[PDB]
Amino acid sequence: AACTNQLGIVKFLLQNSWQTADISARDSVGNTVLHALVEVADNTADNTKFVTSMYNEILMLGAKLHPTLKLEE
Amino acid sequence: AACTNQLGIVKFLLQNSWQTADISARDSVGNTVLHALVEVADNTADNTKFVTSMYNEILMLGAKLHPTLKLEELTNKKGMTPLALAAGTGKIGVLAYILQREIQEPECRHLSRKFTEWAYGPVHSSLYDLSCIDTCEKNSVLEVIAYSSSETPNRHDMLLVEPLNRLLQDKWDRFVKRIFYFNFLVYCLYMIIFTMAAYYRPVDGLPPFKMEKTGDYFRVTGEILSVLGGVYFFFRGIQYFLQRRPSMKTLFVDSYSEMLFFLQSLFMLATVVLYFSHLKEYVASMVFSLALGWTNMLYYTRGFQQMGIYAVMIEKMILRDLCRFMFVYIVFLFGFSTAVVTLIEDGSSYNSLYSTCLELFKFTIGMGDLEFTENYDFKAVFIILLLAYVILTYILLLNMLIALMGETVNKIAQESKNIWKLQRAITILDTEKSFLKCMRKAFRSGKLLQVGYTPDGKDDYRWCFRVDEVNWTTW
Amino acid sequence: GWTNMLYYTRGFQQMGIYAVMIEKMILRDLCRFMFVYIVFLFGFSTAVVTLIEDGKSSYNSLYSTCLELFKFTIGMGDLEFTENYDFKAVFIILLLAYVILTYILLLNMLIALMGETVNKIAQE
Ligand SMILES: CCCC[N@@+]1(CCCCCN2CCCC[C@H]2C(=O)Nc2c(C)cccc2C)CCCC[C@H]1C(=O)Nc1c(C)cccc1C
Ligand code: NA
């Protein structure tokens, strides 16, 4: 959801009622959501625009949900 | 009605109530309406605009009225399809439209030529139809663009349209690069054998020479191999002159490599003729065939991108800056040489036009002597003439030549790259068309994929070339 | 050793950019020019040595004649260095062709290409 520019869907998947996704869950290579978000960027205009935008969005969401978690480290 | 940008009248003439105009009707030349739409285009912006739009509309209408009619494939009396005609005549906007024609309407979607295949997330695979583009057919777009004469405009810019550049690069990287390198190596070996057979030539007596020592066996082997190489290049040049049937202007403006290799072969044959006629002069001919030989290796620089662009620039300078510079320079040099010889009394006797031209040319080299000067009668006149010659040619013309080359370089950055691409394209087509059936069909391009369903209902198989793309909008 | 002091030009902005441009030329332009120039020089040197009969500085060797034709590039060449052939016209034609191709065409074209490269690598 992050790497395909659905802000609504990621907001839902983080703040639903049935089951909320883990923000700091890592994949096979060990990437969080932020690592994959970085690795999808390719230094163009709109791509950089939305990657930076949703990077910021996920930072605010993580600060709200887990204020004691330093997601970026 | 179509060529005048009148959509309504076209729709009426096709979908009226009293008499419908035929859509496959042909004129005296045999051109259909699509051929005419192609010949109307002149590569300008608005013209290409409505020609593409009207081609689209009339093709869709032809599909709707006649789903069983392949309008795009109809040929005129030249057997020359609308795509083929657009390629040959040099209409680039129409070609760019046709080769990337993508139609959204599912009822006639089979018309299009660029098919998206899967669009997971932001990535798209695309198939470009290669029918009547690859060399396997006759009058293919690639062959027609490559073997086009000099007059056809946009000749080396028609080859940047998708998928043509990618298709040619795929042919190259897949099987043509290896063959080109092997040819390069064989030519290098031929030139080395020729060079070392020339270097150790016998110097005593008249030709031919009695093969006596052990090394003489090696030398006659090298001589034979050089003669075979020369005759092979001679016959290859003759085959070129027969295959392409080029005009005199085309020969003298756009076949320089073929002309040069042919000329070197001519020099080799003259060398053989003289050598078997007991003449020292054979060496002269042989020597020229040597120099050209090594020079001709710059041909193979087209296999490499940087060096290919470099050699293209070399040619552009030779053909446009150096020629005019040499004309002016010859005028000045001959004028002042005649003047100086007129001053000079009984002449290293410099009372001949050749010797004085040689001195005044030494001035251009950077080895000019101002003091071969004991044999005139007026020192002031002589030195004024020499200073005038120096200032005009050495200081003015040469630096002006440097400046003009700088300007030309700044002016042909892109044309050089396009010309190199076209040179490599000619190399690829010639290499491919010069093999056997087994290998040629063993290295066709693209797959025989399933596009979709023809309006008849059955499957549609098209030789499609696959291209991967990413887009960060239009989800 | 001495030509490694250009390394320390890093510490000064103008000289550092200058040395970076020197590197860029050596890699972009000089290599291509040298390849083409070597091809031409070797071809014409082989032709001239073949034409030249018994050398007896006895330029009937490939090395000495390559050196003689290289002298032209540095503005010090001699158009009549041997007199030891059988066809003066062929010798002169070859030397004039070499001078026109390399001294006039190639070297000035190299200057032009360095000019363009300077224009294009101002910020890099
Ligand atoms: C100036 C011709 C270059 C044009 N050419 C030929 C390149 C192969 C050998 C060229 N050699 C190599 C060295 C540099 C110059 C030249 C040469 O030997 N000079 C020369 C002479 C005449 C006498 C004595 C001594 C010398 C050095 C480039 C590639 C394809 C064949 C042809 C061409 O036709 N190119 C093209 C096409 C296909 C289509 C459209 C337009 C164009 C321009
Ligand atoms: Na000098």
Largest interface chains and counts:
B-C, 47 and 43 residues
Strand content of chain A: under 5%
> How would you describe the oligomerization state of the chains in this entry?
part of a larger assembly
Helix fraction bin of chain A: 40-55%
Largest sheet of chain A: none
The small-molecule ligands in this entry are: the ligand CCCC[N@@+]1(CCCCCN2CCCC[C@H]2C(=O)Nc2c(C)cccc2C)CCCC[C@H]1C(=O)Nc1c(C)cccc1C, sodium ion
Strand-pairing-aware structural class of chain A: mainly alpha
PDB class: membrane protein
Keywords: ion channel, membrane protein, cryo-EM
Entry title: structure of human trpv1 in complex with BC5
Chains A, B, C: Transient receptor potential cation channel subfamily V member 1
Write the layout of secondary structure elements.
The structure is cut from a larger assembly and holds three copies of chain A.
Chain A: H1 7-14, H2 33-40, H3 45-65
Helix pairs in contact in A: 2-3
The complex binds ligand A1LZ2 and sodium ion.
Ligand A1LZ2 is lined by residues 254-257, 260, 295-296, 298-299, 314-315, 318, 419, 422-423, 426 of chain B.
PDB class: membrane protein
Keywords: ion channel, membrane protein, cryo-EM
Entry title: structure of human trpv1 in complex with BC5
